[PDB]
Design a protein around this ligand. Structure first.
Ligand SMILES: [Ca+2]
Ligand SMILES: [Ca+2]
Ligand SMILES: [Ca+2]
Ligand SMILES: [Ca+2]
Lengths: 12, 93, 93, 12
């Protein structure tokens, strides 16, 4: 969850 | 205040209203989920312009492998981006 | 609908209003947390009559070991009991 | 989390 969370906020 | 009393009323009345527009009376589908957010939480939660966000979040948000999302799953992840994105505000510009 | 737009307004206006009554401008403490829920979410979220619920939830809800609760931690666990308890309704009587 | 969750709902 936290690992993929960075992708959404980073990629946004 | 009487703000929270209304808050719960707003969340559930809209949750079950559009969630049963074409799917089941109270279960969400990838198509019900993206229409419900582009409807009132515009510019807050995104799904239409960001396609990677829809397949990656919705398919993994149904962490149980249900191509349908339950009310409990929708409130936790969607509300995260709701307060989180607001904190960054334009200050991140 | 315009329900969700108001929903976010209700949650945050009341969150920061009482959260800074005696503690910090925007951080919760065991004492700010229990007063905020007995205030408008009465009979929905409990903390005063159930003492075991307060120490066990608040101390473990600060899963990071912060005797203070952040807005993100409060929305996830408190909102869980909010929709969950409503589903049981009196039908569980 | 889930283990303690039963206590709150069970004890309520
Ligand atoms: Ca449905
Ligand atoms: Ca699901
Ligand atoms: Ca405070
Ligand atoms: Ca904390």
């Amino acid at each position: 969850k936290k690992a993929v969370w960075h992708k959404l906020l980073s990629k946004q | 205040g009487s703000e929270l009393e209304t808050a719960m009323e707003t969340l559930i009345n809209v949750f079950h209203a559009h969630s049963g527009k074409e799917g089941d009376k109270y279960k969400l589908s990838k198509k019900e989920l993206k229409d419900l957010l582009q409807t009132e939480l515009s510019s807050f939660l995104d799904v239409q312009k960001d396609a990677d966000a829809v397949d990656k979040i919705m398919k993994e948000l149904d962490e149980n492998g249900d191509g349908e999302v339950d009310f409990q799953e929708f409130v936790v992840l969607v509300a995260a981006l709701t307060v989180a994105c607001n904190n960054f505000f334009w200050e991140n510009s």
